[PDB]
Amino acid sequence: MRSYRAQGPLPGFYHYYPGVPAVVGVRVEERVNFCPAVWNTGLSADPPLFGVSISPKRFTHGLLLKARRFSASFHPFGQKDLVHWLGSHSGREVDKGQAPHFLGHTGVPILEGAYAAYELELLEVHTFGDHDLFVGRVVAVWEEEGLKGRPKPGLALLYYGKGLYGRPAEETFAP
Amino acid sequence: MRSYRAQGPLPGFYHYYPGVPAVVGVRVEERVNFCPAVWNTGLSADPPLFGVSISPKRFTHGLLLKARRFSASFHPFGQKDLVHWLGSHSGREVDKGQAPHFLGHTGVPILEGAYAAYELELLEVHTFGDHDLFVGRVVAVWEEEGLLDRPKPGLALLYYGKGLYGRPAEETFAP
Numbered sequence A: 001m002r003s004y005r006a007q008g009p010l011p012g013f014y015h016y017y018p019g020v021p022a023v024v025g026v027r028v029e030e031r032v033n034f035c036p037a038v039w040n041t042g043l044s045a046d047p048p049l050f051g052v053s054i055s056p057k058r059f060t061h062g063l064l065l066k067a068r069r070f071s072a073s074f075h076p077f078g079q080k081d082l083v084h085w086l087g088s089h090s091g092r093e094v095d096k097g098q099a100p101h102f103l104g105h106t107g108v109p110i111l112e113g114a115y116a117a118y119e120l121e122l123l124e125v126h127t128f129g130d131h132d133l134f135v136g137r138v139v140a141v142w143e144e145e146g147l148k149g150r151p152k153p154g155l156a157l158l159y160y161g162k163g164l165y166g167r168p169a170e171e172t173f174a175p
Numbered sequence B: 001m002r003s004y005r006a007q008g009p010l011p012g013f014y015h016y017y018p019g020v021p022a023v024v025g026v027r028v029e030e031r032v033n034f035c036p037a038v039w040n041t042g043l044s045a046d047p048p049l050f051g052v053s054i055s056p057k058r059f060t061h062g063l064l065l066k067a068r069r070f071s072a073s074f075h076p077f078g079q080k081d082l083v084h085w086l087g088s089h090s091g092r093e094v095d096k097g098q099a100p101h102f103l104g105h106t107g108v109p110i111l112e113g114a115y116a117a118y119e120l121e122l123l124e125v126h127t128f129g130d131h132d133l134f135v136g137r138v139v140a141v142w143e144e145e146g147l148l149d150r151p152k153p154g155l156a157l158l159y160y161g162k163g164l165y166g167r168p169a170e171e172t173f174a175p
C-alpha cells in the first residue's frame, strides 16, 4: 500500500466519498438560497441532530447565521443536474429562490423533488479549519411516501467529488 | 409529501443514508480495536480534517480519548461481512485486534484490505446530544493504487442503516 505523510492540503481529499449531498435551503426575509453540502453527517439520535460543514466563502454561510434555521433535503438521482447547478453558482450572482421549492412548518425553504428533508433549528457553529460545522436540531421531517425509513434502492444521488455523480447499485446485502 | 414535527427521537434516522462507513482503528499500548462509523465527514481541506461521531457507549470512545490518535480506513464492498462484524460486537467482549491489520507511521492500527486510510491526530472532541464528534487532523495517507481512480466504480461499501449494505452503481455522470 502506497503512503505519504501530510504536508498540507491533500492532492485530493476524496478517499471517503461517495456521499449523499444534503441540499441546504435557507431563507432571510424574501431571499431564498440553496446549496449542496456533501460534508454532512448525523450527530445524535436522542435528540436528533444533523450537521452540515459550510465554507465561510459561501453566500449560504452568512444566511445561516442570520436565519438560524434551515432545511436539509435529500434528492433522487434524477435531480443530479439541478443539484450540481446549485453547487456551481452562488446566490451572490443568481436567484436560486426561483428553483421550485416550498416553505416548511418553520418557514425554511425546501427544494422540491426530494425523497426526504429535515427542518432544522441551528444549535451551534464550530470552526474547524476552513469550514464551519453548523449543527442543527431536527424539528420537522418530510418524507415522500413509497421511497424502516431507509431511502429506496438505487434512488439516492451520490457525489464522488470534482463534478462526478452516481447512485447506489440496486442490490443490497444484510449480513 | 408527508410531514411531522419531531417529538423526540425519530422513528428512523436514515433519510440521509447511505454513506461510507469509516473503520476507526485505535491502539492503547498492546490493545487494538476497530469500530465502523457511518457518521463521518470531511470538515476542512486546508488543513485536512476529518471527523467521526462516536457514542460514549462504544469501547472505542475511551480508547480514542486515551490515544488521541486513530486511523480511519475505507473498505471495498468485498469486506462487507468483516465491517459488519466489527460493528456488531464490542472490544469489551472480543479482541478485535485479531482482525488483520498493520501499524502506520504514527502507530495507529489500520484494518487490512482498505482501498484508502488516514492516520489522524485528534485535535478536538465535541459533544452533540448522545454522540461525541472526534475531529482529527490527517497526518498520513494510505492508498491502494489498484483500487482507486476515490474508490474505482462500484468498489465503495455503502451502509443504509440497520444491517443493510450496498455499493455504488458502476455508471457515473459529470455534467
Ligand SMILES: Cc1cc2nc3c(=O)[nH]c(=O)nc-3n(C[C@H](O)[C@H](O)[C@H](O)COP(=O)(O)O)c2cc1C
Pocket: A021, A033, A034, A035, A036, A037, A038, A039, A040, A053, A054, A055, A057, A058, A059, A060, A061, A083, A084, A086, A087, A088, A089, A090, A091, A092, A131, A159
Ligand atoms: C455535490 C456538491 C457538494 C458540495 N458540498 C459542499 C460542502 O459540504 N460544503 C461547502 O462549503 N460547499 C460545498 N459545495 C460547494 C457549494 O455547493 C458551492 O460553493 C455553492 O455554489 C455555494 O453557493 P452560495 O454561495 O449561494 O452559498 C458543494 C458543491 C457540490 C456540487
Ligand SMILES: Cc1cc2nc3c(=O)[nH]c(=O)nc-3n(C[C@H](O)[C@H](O)[C@H](O)COP(=O)(O)O)c2cc1C
Pocket: B021, B033, B034, B035, B036, B037, B038, B039, B040, B053, B054, B055, B057, B058, B059, B060, B061, B083, B084, B086, B087, B088, B089, B090, B091, B092, B131, B159
Ligand atoms: C455500518 C456501521 C456503522 C456504524 N456507525 C457508527 C457511528 O457513526 N457512531 C457510533 O457510535 N457507532 C456506530 N456503529 C456502531 C459501532 O460500530 C458498534 O457499536 C461497535 O460494536 C462498537 O464497538 P466497540 O464497543 O468495540 O467500540 C456502526 C456500526 C455499523 C455496523
Ligand SMILES: O=Cc1ccc(O)cc1
Pocket: A038, A039, A055, A131, A159, A160, A161, A162
Ligand atoms: O465534495 C465537494 C466539496 C466542495 C466544497 C466543499 O467546501 C466541501 C466539499
Ligand SMILES: O=Cc1ccc(O)cc1
Pocket: B038, B039, B054, B055, B131, B159, B161, B162
Ligand atoms: O448507522 C448506524 C449507526 C449505528 C450507531 C451509531 O451510533 C450511529 C449510526
